[PDB]
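Practice problem: cell filamentation protein
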Amino acid sequence: TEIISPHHYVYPNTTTLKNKYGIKNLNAFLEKCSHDTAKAMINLREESLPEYFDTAYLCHIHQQLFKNTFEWAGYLRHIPFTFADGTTAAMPEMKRTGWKNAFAIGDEIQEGLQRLDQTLAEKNNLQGLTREEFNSEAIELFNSLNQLHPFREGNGRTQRLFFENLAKAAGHQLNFSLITKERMMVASVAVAENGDLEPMQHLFEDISNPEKIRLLKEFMHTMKNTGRNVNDRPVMVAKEGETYTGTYRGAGLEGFALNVKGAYIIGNIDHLPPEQLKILKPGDKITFTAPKAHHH
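Answer key — structure tokens:
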């Protein structure tokens, strides 16, 4: 023993992260872990928002969400951590294939977290800003905190609560729960692989704009009695300029859904002609252009 290694995060002869439950079975653990972190979220949302938004808080969120799951709850992945079993683990480098885009390695993690805290303190937690101004600044930090992959596990949950609170503090919304797993994967990869903010800006918009949030919430709530589920597919509210051709998938009170190349595009029921609403049966193949209004 006595050699720091990433392999010491997982039980020997497994790929299942060492946990407080003592559950070596991968699926058994994942179930237990999900249940507890679910409860932890409900409790965290109750607690006051902080004076400062910094890595101290990011770690607090992690510590609190995973106190019952991981021994290393509050700790970043570059800080070597000794388990009660005696072994010590650290993962300065996350690793991809050479042709893919890179996470921060070791010392880079802290240097980045410093800049994260730095720029936040300098901009008053992005407080006195408009949505467009805020989102623009918040996306930069979100992408930046994504490439640093601070924790060994649970980067997404704790990162998204962080920014959700950062927005509430700053007098805005970021309803991340509306975003499917698949959409986040796509928006993140876009930024990481291509350097493209198109989908991320789109993601933030739908999640921040009240009129669009109203639409997504409705779509997500109707995924209740069906015997189904939509994390595998990206769900989006049609961009103001863009035109979407796809099969019609019914309408609710405030919105309607299309199926464009697998993805679900949501439109405002008012942007359709009423004359058509009545006629449109499900699965009708419609080409819909959303309205746009530029200000100059």
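Discussion: DSSP finds nine helices and seven strands in the chain. Students who identified this feature from the tokens alone can consider the problem solved.
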